[PDB]
Amino acid sequence: RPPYSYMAMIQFAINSTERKRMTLKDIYTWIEDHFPYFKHIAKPGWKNSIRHNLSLHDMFVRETSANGKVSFWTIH
Amino acid sequence: VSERPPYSYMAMIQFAINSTERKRMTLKDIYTWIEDHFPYFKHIAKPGWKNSIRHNLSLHDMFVRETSANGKVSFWTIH
DNA sequence: ACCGTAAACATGTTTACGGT
């Protein structure tokens, strides 16, 4: 287990992007890649904890692309 | 009167979306607009019609979505 | 091809509880 909260590990991913925005599936991939704990050990429930933290903490606001066909997560 | 209205789902959605000042509407306000302007969906239809409306929104490409600045409200808009 | 219906899966919103 990594010594970071979900809110912490999520913002790490979003801050790692060029356009200060990240898709949910790209948040999973970033956490799986940068913390091998979630790729090999954690039960599939950790993706539920990720969605739970995003909607709850107000720092995570979403925004839609110009094409209006992709919904991103960004920090305020 | 509440007999079925002669409009497709895509049609009744555009009526709702275009009836706003900013050509935009939240999903719950689309249900409410169709329920209020066509009592068929308020008194008769089984809960599946809300599944078909969402189905129409995602499938037809003319229905694109837009988010508020507060990032806490998701709208449906036409381009 | 088009519309309507159903259902599975992905994603976003909430309440709820035990433990760090």
Add this chain to the structure above:
DNA sequence: ACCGTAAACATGTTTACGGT
């Protein structure tokens, strides 16, 4: 006080089928 974890509900994305 609040995280971590679970589950129910709302919303968005898809494939699949029968009928006109």
